[PDB]
């Protein structure tokens, strides 16, 4: 195991400062946190000053997933064989009850116990709930202005849809339901003159220059 | 043993300049100080200009832990066998009476003597006492303003609680004791209308937009 480089912490601290809890901070978290042990993950979360409300919401989500892991992967009493390793509990995956050496031993075992990937899934799950919840705009409030260029409105549309709560079933049908409807009347007449089944490229091109 | 990279010292010096002794400087200290020998740790502390009051408090805490180590791990007189190594004293773990080569020999022994991890625990223990002591706010003084958004008050709440002295038993019960009580009357009526056992996500969502 090699350590978090100073440029990796530096970039994670700065991206939380700049982008706060916008959707694009989760993929950069997972990218910066790649191959990380639970101890490295806890270090990344501990370096975040401020936003302590979301960090507390992150702890509750992790505690929920850890309790589900303990119900689905119950521990068994008994001495550990010399060649093998004890199973990780919920707190073990979160780095609470486990050491760095045990986390490595789980991640390099045969078969390996990717405790880092499991913990990262819990953190990302808790981070996804914070992003959509910190969003103050619904997809229904995204309407094209009388002179708003069509690309700018479609840009706000899918930026809102990405951070939207709702569900994937709503996001899949949002374009066919709300995009053309909430466009301004001049662009709307052009889009209806294309017929359903038109791609986004065909819609944006038909309303270019308007 | 490879040396502290110039980017690692640079990042440690700058984080002490910017964040001073806020809670998030301890995890970044432990991250930047990973796999470090006692000599590398002393170098990191010696690069800190200013804050010499806390650095002197750090020396006293380290001297206390080193004295406890000498009482719990007493030395034994006798010549060291050619294949092995002498036990580290308290000053040896702090890099005072030990060389770089002996620190490596302890950390790469079989079984290894992680003198760097032991010294880091003492430093982090001394740094934790400085952070909570340099905090000028108690969790009891965190009250939500008449128009303070609920997320901002919860942000100040857990930022104060993180740097709070008190004890973990108080921090565990602080949310159920002080959070809803010190909220403004308009958000307070909504939170009491949810019933106890509500998660933080449920509390912050119920008072959104207020």
């Amino acid at each position: 195991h090699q350590c978090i480089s100073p440029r990796t912490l530096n970039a994670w601290v700065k991206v939380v400062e700049e982008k706060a809890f916008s959707p694009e901070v989760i993929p950069m978290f997972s990218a910066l946190s790649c191959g990380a042990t639970p101890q490295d993950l806890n270090t990344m979360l501990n370096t975040v000053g401020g936003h302590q409300a979301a960090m507390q919401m992150l702890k509750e989500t992790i505690n929920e997933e850890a309790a589900e892991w303990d119900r689905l992967h119950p521990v068994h009493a008994g001495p550990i064989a010399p060649g093998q390793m004890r199973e990780p509990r919920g707190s073990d995956i979160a780095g609470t009850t486990s050491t760095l050496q045990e986390q490595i031993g789980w991640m390099t075992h045969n078969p390996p116990i990717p405790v880092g990937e499991i913990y990262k899934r819990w953190i990302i799950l808790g981070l996804n709930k914070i992003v959509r919840m910190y969003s103050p705009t619904s997809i229904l409030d995204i309407r094209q202005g009388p002179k708003e260029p069509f690309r700018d409105y479609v840009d706000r549309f899918y930026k809102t849809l990405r951070a939207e709560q709702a569900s994937q079933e709503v996001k899949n049908a949002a374009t066919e339901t709300l995009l053309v409807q909430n466009a301004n009347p001049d662009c709307k007449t052009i889009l209806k003159a294309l017929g359903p089944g038109a791609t986004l490229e065909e819609m944006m091109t038909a309303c270019q220059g308007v | 043993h490879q040396c502290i990279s110039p980017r690692t010292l640079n990042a440690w010096v700058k984080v002490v300049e910017e964040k001073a002794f806020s809670p998030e400087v301890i995890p970044m200290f432990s991250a930047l100080s990973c796999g470090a020998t006692p000599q590398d740790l002393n170098t990191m502390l010696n690069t800190v200009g200013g804050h010499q009051a806390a650095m002197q408090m750090l020396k006293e805490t380290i001297n206390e832990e080193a004295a406890e180590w000498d009482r719990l791990h007493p030395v034994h007189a006798g010549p060291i066998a050619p294949g092995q190594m002498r036990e580290p004293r308290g000053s040896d773990i702090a890099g005072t009476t030990s060389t770089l080569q002996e620190q490596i020999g302890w950390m790469t022994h079989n079984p290894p003597i992680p003198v760097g991890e032991i010294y880091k625990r003492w430093i982090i223990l001394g740094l934790n006492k400085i952070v909570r002591m340099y905090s000028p706010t108690s969790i009891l003084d965190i009250r939500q303003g008449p128009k303070e958004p609920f997320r901002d008050y919860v942000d100040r709440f857990y930022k104060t609680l993180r740097a709070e002295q008190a004890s973990q038993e108080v921090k565990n019960a602080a949310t159920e004791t002080l959070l809803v009580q010190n909220a403004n009357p308009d958000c307070k009526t909504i939170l009491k209308a949810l019933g106890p056992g509500a998660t933080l996500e449920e509390m912050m969502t119920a008072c959104q937009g207020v």
Partner: peptide, 12 residues
């Protein structure tokens, strides 16, 4: 529930 409020991630 391993993680505690006001405590560093990963326990003491």
């Amino acid at each position: 529930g391993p993680l505690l409020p006001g405590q560093s991630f990963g326990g003491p």
